[PDB]
């Protein structure tokens, strides 16, 4: 407090330092836990466009400087922002008829919902008796991995309107999904996300693998979103000549890499 007063005296009133509000840790932990679920607290307010908690100015913690405490809380708020924004991005629930991302993407989002459920379970498993620094260090790796995966999936926590990051690419589907997953797995093969990325790839391929099974066994194209490389043109599929084989079911050959 003395040092902040001295700094204010030196700054001649121009730096309106937000008044340091001293809060008890047995409370700060609760605010941190709310951030871990992306919930805004008395110290952290949710910035709606970012779906991000914003720290109340002038948060003071006992035993630490309000500026240093604010820095720590800013890092924790960034992790909570990543959690809440990622949850919202993954929260696209139902593969309804308006869902154009396909069944592989829908299954991926289901797996992502499972992942976020596991994250919530972990956050709830965190005892509120842990230290703020201990909790921060324990979740530092997990938050970094979550941020890396969110950027990798284009579902990065940054608000699309405020982040001058270019347009977050639509989550790849079908062959595009497979290529995206393969590239990320190669790039993230050393990360803690590599097993998780493999799990998500399996889960997203499961509807695609069912479609593949039906195509291979019955020649039935079960691709509801056009993700399979083969399209069936039923007008020629009813043909009883060479044209039946060539045009009734057509494999999209030109973009074989994309199909």
């Amino acid at each position: 407090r003395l040092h902040q007063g001295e700094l204010q005296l030196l700054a001649g009133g121009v730096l309106q330092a937000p008044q340091p509000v001293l809060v008890k840790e047995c409370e700060l932990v609760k605010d941190v836990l709310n951030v871990l679920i992306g919930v805004v607290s008395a110290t952290f307010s949710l910035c709606q466009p970012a779906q991000a908690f914003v720290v109340k100015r002038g948060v003071h913690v006992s035993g630490a400087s309000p500026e240093s405490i604010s820095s720590l809380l800013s890092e924790v708020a960034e992790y909570g922002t990543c959690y809440t924004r990622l949850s919202h991005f993954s929260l696209q629930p139902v593969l309804d008829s308006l869902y154009s991302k396909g069944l592989v993407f829908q299954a991926f989002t289901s797996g992502l919902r499972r992942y976020l459920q596991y994250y919530r379970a972990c956050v709830l498993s965190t005892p509120p008796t842990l230290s703020l620094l201990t909790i921060g260090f324990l979740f530092k790796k997990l938050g970094r991995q979550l941020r890396y995966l969110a950027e990798l999936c284009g579902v990065g926590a940054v608000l699309p309107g405020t982040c001058g990051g270019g347009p977050r690419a639509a989550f790849p589907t079908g062959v595009k999904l497979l290529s995206y997953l393969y590239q990320e797995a190669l790039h993230n093969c050393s990360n803690e996300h590599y097993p998780v990325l493999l799990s998500l790839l399996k889960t997203s391929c499961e509807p695609y693998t069912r479609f593949i099974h039906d195509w291979v066994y019955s020649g039935v194209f079960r691709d509801a979103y056009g993700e399979f490389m083969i399209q069936v043109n039923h007008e020629y599929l009813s043909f009883r000549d060479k044209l039946y084989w060539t045009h009734g079911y057509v494999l999209i050959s030109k973009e074989v890499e994309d199909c």
Partner: protein
């Protein structure tokens, strides 16, 4: 197995022995080749 249990460790043993593309190839093409 892949990622479907918890305590299970063999579920990823191939995933640690084999690379994800090679693991997926081995896992998918063998039944695929049989059916084809």
């Amino acid at each position: 197995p892949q990622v479907q249990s918890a305590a299970d460790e063999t579920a990823v043993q191939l995933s640690e022995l084999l690379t994800l593309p090679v693991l997926m190839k081995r896992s998918i093409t063998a039944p695929l080749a049989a059916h084809i």
